[PDB]
Design a protein around this ligand. Structure first.
Ligand code: MH0
Ligand SMILES: Cc1cc(Br)ccc1O
Length: 137
């Protein structure tokens, strides 16, 4: 299930982090407006760009931390406060996170792997709820 999926993603994190974020940017091309330096690049060119690789892996590093600290796919309130407070997240509405998890769940369903996609769906919803409580509009 969910706990084994955290280990599976961590075992090849840079690839999963990049492939899931590309899934997200290609499903929701308007989210590029938060990522001006990614506009007008193919997936292969994005994988060539320093901030892309390094920022995507740091995002997923923290995402797997928040997943690991969760109980029954409910993140800690402290982890929601961190995500809301962070300067880099000034722009952001819960909708942005909801779209990221919609793309993450679709990626997992399309893989031949026994990912617990329902758990990730619940995780995304619960994190969105936690982000709202901690004040994100
Ligand atoms: C689609 C909007 C959006 C969503 C959703 C989002 C969701 C998440 N975030 Fe995070 N984040 C978003 C937009 C940004 C921006 C715009 C930046 C600025 C850095 C950059 O390189 O673009 C950023 N996030 C930056 C970060 C960084 C630091 C990157 C760096 O500068 O090296 C971390 C660790 C991070 N986030 C955490 C997370 C986690 C964890 C999640 C999932 C729960
Ligand atoms: C800055 C950033 C945000 C998300 Br969500 C995914 C990857 C990435 O580099």
């Amino acid at each position: 299930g969910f706990k084994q999926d955290i280990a599976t993603l961590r075992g090849d994190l840079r690839t999963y982090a990049q492939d899931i974020f590309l899934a997200f940017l290609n499903k929701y091309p308007d989210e590029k407006r938060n990522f001006k330096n990614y506009v007008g690049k193919s997936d292969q060119e994005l994988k060539s760009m320093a901030k892309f690789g390094d920022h995507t892996e740091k995002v997923f590093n923290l995402m797997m931390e928040v997943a690991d600290r969760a109980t029954d796919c409910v993140p800690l309130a402290s982890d929601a406060s961190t995500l809301v407070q962070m300067k880099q997240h000034s722009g952001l509405t819960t909708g942005n996170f909801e779209k990221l998890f919609v793309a993450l769940v679709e990626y997992m369903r399309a893989s031949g792997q026994s990912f617990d996609s329902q758990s990730w769906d619940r995780f995304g919803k619960n994190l969105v709820s936690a982000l709202s409580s901690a004040g994100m509009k």
